[PDB]
């Protein structure tokens, strides 16, 4: 196995902020939850109880981001992720054909209670779009994602 | 700033962990 690098335990810390939307340090159900409807999934409170009893070490009920660490760390171990990547992908690219467009990427980050401004949502677009084509396709946000 | 990553991210972690069930079909 491989340690954990430090631009990865930042890469993490910013991924679990947010589903921490209320900032204490743990992730709820209903936390989870909302993040899963937000991609479309109608997830049960059962399930979703069962989720977040799998990562839960000490059984409290809730994820903190240590738990969080070791869930990354097996994600990345066990074969290598992905599924995870394209799944975010076909949440963002509502009309599925293949390209996140800026008002897809804002209808997105406004549901999702993130009120961006015009210059916020361009420079979303600019930074990702490496082609110059306007919009963000697969390869675009895996690199924008994949970090380093 | 403008990193679809933490929002992207984020989501990566709970979708992985919907697809982590490995296949349920039995
Ligand atoms: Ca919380
Ligand atoms: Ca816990
Ligand atoms: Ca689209
Ligand atoms: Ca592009």
Redesign the pocket.
Known sequence: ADQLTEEQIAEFKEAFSLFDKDGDGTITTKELGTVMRSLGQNPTEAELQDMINEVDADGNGTIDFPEFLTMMARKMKDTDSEEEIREAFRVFDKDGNGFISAAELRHVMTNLGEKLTDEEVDEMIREA?????????YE?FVTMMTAK | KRRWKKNFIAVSAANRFKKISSSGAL
């Open positions: 779009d490496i082609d110059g084509d306007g919009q963000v396709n675009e």
